[PDB]
Ligand binder design. Structure first.
Ligand SMILES: CCCCCCCC
Length: 204
């Protein structure tokens, strides 16, 4: 995780699109290592949105230099169909997948656990779902999440998968390092959606 740190935010809190997409493109591969085919469509969603954004960027890298540039250009370019269109829509869902990973990792690092089932990560995933995704899912998808929860690896196994021959404590310290700029970046993205009134709450 800490081999592909996100850059700190610059003083003007503008996120450059190219470096951002390069950075987060390192996350979907972690889903191949969780030991379940349940993760294949999850990986496709997150990668699919990165791809959607990268393809808008590639048409005009200068015009789409920053994530802010994307939202403002698309607002102008699309009129009434915006923000439910283009790279704006893909980023709206990408941020929520990114926020999920953030809350989950942070929960693990903060030592939140089920006292009764200490080596499970179900409480951490459940928190992350509630905070990042749940309100945008209808009852069917929520039910699928409840089923998929059972495919979670054991905590000890998860951390081992993210790690070199390194202790669990060492692994978590590196996860903490990653979370600094990751969290900061996602926060700026969420703030941007709020300022631009680009957030939608439709359920799927
Ligand atoms: C620089 C972004 C590349 C697009 C990859 C989509 C899969 C994670």
């Amino acid at each position: 995780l800490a081999e592909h740190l996100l850059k700190p935010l610059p003083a003007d809190k503008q996120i450059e699109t190219g470096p951002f997409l390069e950075a987060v493109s390192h996350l979907p591969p972690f889903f191949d290592c969780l030991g379940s085919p349940v993760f294949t469509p999850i990986k496709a969603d997150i990668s699919g949105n990165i791809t959607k954004i990268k393809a808008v960027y590639d048409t005009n890298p200068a015009k789409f230099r920053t994530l802010q540039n994307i939202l403002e250009v698309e607002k102008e370019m699309y009129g009434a169909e915006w923000p439910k269109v283009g790279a704006t829509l893909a980023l709206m869902w990408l941020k929520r997948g990114l926020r999920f990973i953030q809350v989950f990792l942070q929960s693990i690092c903060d030592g939140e656990r089920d006292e009764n089932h200490p080596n499970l990560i179900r409480v951490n995933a459940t928190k992350a779902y509630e905070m990042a995704l749940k309100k945008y899912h209808g009852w069917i998808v929520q039910k699928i999440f409840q089923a998929a929860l059972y495919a979670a690896p054991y905590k000890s196994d998860f951390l081992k998968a993210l790690s070199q021959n390194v202790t669990e404590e060492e692994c978590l310290e590196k996860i903490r390092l990653f979370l600094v700029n990751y969290t900061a970046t996602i926060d700026v993205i969420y703030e941007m959606y709020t300022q631009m009134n680009a957030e939608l709450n439709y359920k799927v």
